[PDB]
Design a protein around this ligand. Structure first.
Ligand SMILES: CC(C)(C)OC(=O)N[C@@H](Cc1ccccc1)[C@H](O)CN[C@@H](Cc1ccccc1)C(=O)N[C@@H](CCC(=O)O)C(=O)N[C@@H](Cc1ccccc1)C(N)=O
Ligand SMILES: [Cl-]
Ligand SMILES: [Cl-]
Ligand SMILES: [Cl-]
Ligand code: NA
Lengths: 99, 99
């Protein structure tokens, strides 16, 4: 795809068979997700956003499908109103910013 | 350019007589800069992200040069940990996401 930015770059993703909605975010180093069931063990992490710091649950080696692109990586679960796909995963589908 | 995402997509911008480094951020609705002096009228605004909400000064019709484009838009100034270029200005330089 080529996605313009007149509206939020929301895309369907698929995790553990569930379809959900996530924002493609070039300003996010990491992928941060709303509360949901993830398979393995988690460790603690703190990360910073525009509003300040939050505590998250870090899960590794998680399979996500993004617009038909399979992707495996680290996913952070915490207080967010939006699922955010960050650079750690955008680099795996070959995403670039073009102008 | 075609900008890959292995590192933070930082760009030098020119605003209110000053040179700033900022983050091309497709997950941000608005442009938000670290504390600085800017010409003109401003009104207050509340914005959010990871970590919650912050209060920022909203300045309308600000001229910003980005990679040789002179664009116009609203710029917010506030206690952000980082200067961010959001979709309101990204659309104006024709920036798209591609994969
Ligand atoms: C997601 C992680 C990995 C934690 O990274 C960042 O948050 N990085 C931010 C930059 C940064 C780097 C280093 C240190 C500190 C900050 C990006 O801006 C992240 N982009 C989004 C992430 C996001 C999207 C959607 C929901 C929550 C969070 C963002 O904050 N976007 C804000 C930027 C500020 C702005 O545009 O005004 C936004 O669109 N805010 C809207 C939408 C909104 C409304 C209410 C609550 C939350 C979001 C708004 N009108 O305030
Ligand atoms: Cl990863
Ligand atoms: Cl604007
Ligand atoms: Cl366009
Ligand atoms: Na690089």
């Amino acid at each position: 795809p080529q996605i313009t930015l007149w509206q939020r770059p929301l895309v369907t993703i698929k995790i553990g068979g569930q379809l959900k909605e996530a924002l493609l975010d070039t300003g996010a180093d990491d992928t941060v997700l709303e509360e949901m069931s993830l398979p393995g063990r988690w460790k603690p992490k703190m990360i910073g956003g525009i509003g300040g710091f939050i505590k998250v649950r870090q899960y590794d080696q998680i399979l996500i499908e993004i617009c038909g692109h399979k992707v495996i990586g680290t996913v952070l679960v915490g207080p967010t109103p939006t699922n955010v796909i960050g650079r750690n995963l955008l680099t795996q589908i070959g995403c670039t910013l073009n102008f």
